[PDB]
Amino acid sequence: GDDIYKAAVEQLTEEQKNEFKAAFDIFVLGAEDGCISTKELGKVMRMLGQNPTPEELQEMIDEVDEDGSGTVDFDEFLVMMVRCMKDDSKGAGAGVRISADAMMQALLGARAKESLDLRAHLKQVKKED
Template identity: 40%
Template sequence: VFRKKMSSSRKHHLKSLMLQIAKGLLEEEERDREVQRTRYMAENCPPLSFNFPAPEELCREIHRKVDTIDEERYDLEMKVSKSNKEIDDLKIKVQDLMGKFKKPVLKKVRMSADAMLKALLGSKHTVNLDLRANLKQVKKEVKEEDKELRDVGDWRKNIEDKAGMDGRKKMFEAEA
């Protein structure tokens, strides 16, 4: 397919026509937006009616209202500060009634259990917390029957002699 090249003047002419058409479309679009905006405002925002008294009178009325509110605020602040002062005075009176001295901050003291019990119970009571001393001591009693059995039939006694080594093991151990 053979395409013929377009001359530059023709290109320029077509480009200007396209720009004119686009400009017309943009202007029409802007007019439509403006019409929609005015219609929306008319539907949703009714026009303001100025039935107010003169602006100076309106400002005076607003100033009077602000002054009365400021006076009320000042009165309330004074009442609050007065009550806070009364509360502080009552706290001081309560502290005076409870005791004239403040309790000191207690320090940690390392103390043994015996010393603590002596301090709590007084020096008359001596309590010893040595638990091993309070344990009951049990002596191992060996029955006479067990002694006889051990003498007669104890296979562990002189095991080297019964093994037939005749004390040679002890001899080798002494040399080494």
């Protein structure tokens, strides 16, 4: 399954890792957590040659993020770098900024999903898109 990606980060050496280590500086643009949300995730991608959308990106970010805090951890970025470098046929959709679902996924809050009521999470459905 995803043993090629998860193991990828393990294949990287102190030097190879330094490539992405310093990259964060340009990605997060200087942060204490050293993480990047779906919004910024698009700015870092467009640099790799692919300028996808924040709505389509949040899809993988929500799955890659166990806590689904709405951001990407330093380690989470690695697995994405190996999984993306393989499937670069999904890079398209420039001139984008924010998306209803893009930011929504962040407001959802993995912890909020069960904050009030769960049955009230799939009660009102009108095409999420």
